Design an enzyme around this catalytic site. Structure first.
Site, PDB file in Angstrom:
ATOM      1  N   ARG A   1       2.295  -3.547   3.799  1.00  0.00           N
ATOM      2  CA  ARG A   1       1.056  -4.116   3.315  1.00  0.00           C
ATOM      3  C   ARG A   1       0.210  -3.023   2.708  1.00  0.00           C
ATOM      4  NH1 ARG A   1      -1.836  -2.554   8.261  1.00  0.00           N
ATOM      5  NH2 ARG A   1      -0.058  -2.838   9.669  1.00  0.00           N
ATOM      6  N   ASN A   2       0.470  -1.785   3.097  1.00  0.00           N
ATOM      7  CA  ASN A   2      -0.317  -0.676   2.548  1.00  0.00           C
ATOM      8  C   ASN A   2       0.378   0.139   1.486  1.00  0.00           C
ATOM      9  OD1 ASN A   2      -2.544  -1.352   4.102  1.00  0.00           O
ATOM     10  ND2 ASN A   2      -1.958  -0.008   5.778  1.00  0.00           N
TER      11      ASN A   2
ATOM     12  N   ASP B   1      -4.575   2.666   1.256  1.00  0.00           N
ATOM     13  CA  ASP B   1      -5.328   2.473   2.489  1.00  0.00           C
ATOM     14  C   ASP B   1      -5.430   3.708   3.344  1.00  0.00           C
ATOM     15  OD1 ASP B   1      -6.977   1.369   4.356  1.00  0.00           O
ATOM     16  OD2 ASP B   1      -5.485  -0.081   5.117  1.00  0.00           O
TER      17      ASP B   1
ATOM     18  N   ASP C   1      -1.567   4.551   9.095  1.00  0.00           N
ATOM     19  CA  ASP C   1      -1.464   3.106   8.864  1.00  0.00           C
ATOM     20  C   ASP C   1      -0.414   2.674   7.797  1.00  0.00           C
ATOM     21  OD1 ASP C   1      -1.985   0.430   9.465  1.00  0.00           O
ATOM     22  OD2 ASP C   1      -3.722   0.317   8.111  1.00  0.00           O
TER      23      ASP C   1
HETATM   24  N1  LIG Z   1      -5.660  -1.037  -6.457  1.00  0.00           N
HETATM   25  C1  LIG Z   1      -5.315  -2.339  -6.355  1.00  0.00           C
HETATM   26  N2  LIG Z   1      -4.695  -2.973  -7.363  1.00  0.00           N
HETATM   27  C2  LIG Z   1      -4.336  -4.265  -7.232  1.00  0.00           C
HETATM   28  N3  LIG Z   1      -4.570  -5.020  -6.135  1.00  0.00           N
HETATM   29  C3  LIG Z   1      -5.195  -4.505  -5.062  1.00  0.00           C
HETATM   30  C4  LIG Z   1      -5.622  -3.108  -5.113  1.00  0.00           C
HETATM   31  N4  LIG Z   1      -6.214  -2.846  -3.923  1.00  0.00           N
HETATM   32  C5  LIG Z   1      -6.175  -3.985  -3.175  1.00  0.00           C
HETATM   33  N5  LIG Z   1      -5.577  -4.983  -3.866  1.00  0.00           N
HETATM   34  C6  LIG Z   1      -5.331  -6.381  -3.393  1.00  0.00           C
HETATM   35  O1  LIG Z   1      -6.279  -6.846  -2.413  1.00  0.00           O
HETATM   36  C7  LIG Z   1      -5.626  -7.018  -1.148  1.00  0.00           C
HETATM   37  C8  LIG Z   1      -6.647  -6.640  -0.102  1.00  0.00           C
HETATM   38  O2  LIG Z   1      -7.000  -5.278  -0.348  1.00  0.00           O
HETATM   39  P1  LIG Z   1      -7.307  -4.276   0.886  1.00  0.00           P
HETATM   40  O3  LIG Z   1      -8.789  -3.956   0.786  1.00  0.00           O
HETATM   41  O4  LIG Z   1      -6.287  -3.141   0.892  1.00  0.00           O
HETATM   42  O5  LIG Z   1      -7.017  -5.288   2.131  1.00  0.00           O
HETATM   43  P2  LIG Z   1      -7.891  -5.366   3.489  1.00  0.00           P
HETATM   44  O6  LIG Z   1      -7.157  -6.259   4.464  1.00  0.00           O
HETATM   45  O7  LIG Z   1      -9.304  -5.784   3.121  1.00  0.00           O
HETATM   46  N6  LIG Z   1      -7.896  -3.730   4.114  1.00  0.00           N
HETATM   47  P3  LIG Z   1      -6.485  -2.687   4.044  1.00  0.00           P
HETATM   48  O8  LIG Z   1      -5.236  -3.506   3.768  1.00  0.00           O
HETATM   49  O9  LIG Z   1      -6.505  -2.123   5.450  1.00  0.00           O
HETATM   50  O10 LIG Z   1      -6.793  -1.703   2.926  1.00  0.00           O
HETATM   51  C9  LIG Z   1      -4.401  -6.096  -1.242  1.00  0.00           C
HETATM   52  O11 LIG Z   1      -3.293  -6.380  -0.396  1.00  0.00           O
HETATM   53  C10 LIG Z   1      -3.987  -6.380  -2.663  1.00  0.00           C
HETATM   54  O12 LIG Z   1      -3.381  -7.684  -2.758  1.00  0.00           O
END
Ligand SMILES: Nc1ncnc2c1ncn2[C@@H]1O[C@H](COP(=O)(O)OP(=O)(O)NP(=O)(O)O)[C@@H](O)[C@H]1O
Length: 303
Positions: A146-147, A160, A142
């Site tokens: 975005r990841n 991710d 993936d």
């Molecule tokens: N370790 C981190 N530090 C700072 N911001 C984060 C972190 N992890 C996630 N975020 C923020 O939260 C958003 C959503 O997190 P995330 O859970 O990765 O998205 P999701 O759509 O729920 N699933 P995925 O993108 O598949 O992991 C990310 O794009 C970041 O903007």
């Protein structure tokens, strides 16, 4: 044969950390900014805390633990760092805070200030992260802008691991997928390279959507016809030819991550020769007062 996986999984007390802010809600779960103070240690570590959508459906508990499993098993400067889990009622995933957010939003938000040196260094760092996964025989499945997360404009990490697998295992982002993956659900290190190609194209176009318009159903036809993403304005034929090589039908004809590290690295020594960006030469890129004890996760090592 497979070596035993001796990663440590750290369980963290709810009391060791204060939430502070929501970072991202809606979609699937909720990620907070927070500070983790381990036991009796006198350090505070900025962390992201991923407590998934309140409802505790056994389906998605099994999915956050798979990430924890993968993330606990990786250790590289260009892959996201898992500090541990909290088993509260809904499982909390505790990772290193990446304050600048995801690389897709970061390029989208900062186009006018992003130089060739940064773009090519990101490419080098993503390829290092992916090469490391290749060494641990993980297929990410993936990879996308975005990841990838931004610890600082000069330091990114892949994130991710919710779809990662070992090469060989058998157990949908269509626009990032190698043709063998759309057609046959074959997934290899070389299908990760295809997706690297797309991710690079997302960076070079400052966050455009690949095949903007073309609906997912058409995608596999387009590629079999021989169409690919177009050359971004800022890219020399040198950079774009690397993208295109990542997108060859013959999987083994695609570059290896280690070759990608080498090639972008050469380019990064002379960035203006490789990316042509208007105004390149002149571009340049937290909270509370009790911040004496703050330590970034990268400086917090565990025996
Ligand atoms: N370790 C981190 N530090 C700072 N911001 C984060 C972190 N992890 C996630 N975020 C923020 O939260 C958003 C959503 O997190 P995330 O859970 O990765 O998205 P999701 O759509 O729920 N699933 P995925 O993108 O598949 O992991 C990310 O794009 C970041 O903007």
């Amino acid at each position: 044969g497979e070596a035993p996986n001796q990663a440590l999984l750290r369980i963290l007390k709810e009391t060791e950390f204060k939430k502070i802010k929501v970072l991202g809600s809606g979609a699937f779960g909720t990620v907070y900014k927070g500070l983790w103070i381990p036991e009796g240690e006198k350090v505070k570590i900025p962390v992201a805390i991923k407590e998934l959508r309140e409802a505790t459906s056994p389906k998605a508990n099994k999915e956050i633990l798979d990430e924890a499993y993968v993330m606990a098993s990786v250790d590289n400067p260009h892959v996201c760092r898992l500090l541990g889990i909290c088993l509260t009622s809904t499982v909390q995933l505790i990772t290193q805070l990446m304050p600048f957010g995801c690389l897709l939003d970061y390029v989208r938000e900062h186009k006018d200030n992003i130089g060739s040196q940064y773009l090519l260094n990101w490419c080098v760092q993503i390829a290092k992260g992916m090469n490391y996964l290749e060494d641990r025989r993980l297929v990410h499945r993936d990879l996308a802008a975005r990841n990838v997360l931004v610890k600082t404009p000069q330091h990114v990490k892949i994130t991710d691991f919710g779809r990662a697998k070992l090469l060989g295992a058998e157990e949908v982002p269509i626009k990032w997928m190698a043709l063998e993956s759309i057609l046959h659900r074959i997934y290899t290190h070389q299908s990760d390279v295809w997706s690297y190609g797309v991710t690079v194209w997302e960076l070079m176009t400052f966050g455009s959507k690949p095949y903007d318009g073309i609906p997912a159903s058409e995608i596999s036809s387009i590629l079999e016809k021989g169409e690919r993403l177009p050359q971004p304005p800022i890219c020399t034929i040198d950079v774009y030819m690397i993208m295109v090589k990542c997108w060859m039908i013959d999987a083994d004809s695609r570059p290896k991550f280690r070759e990608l590290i080498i090639e972008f690295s050469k380019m990064a020594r002379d960035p203006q020769r490789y990316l042509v960006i208007q105004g390149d030469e002149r571009m340049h890129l937290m909270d509370e007062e009790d911040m004496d004890d703050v330590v970034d996760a990268d400086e917090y090592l565990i025996p």
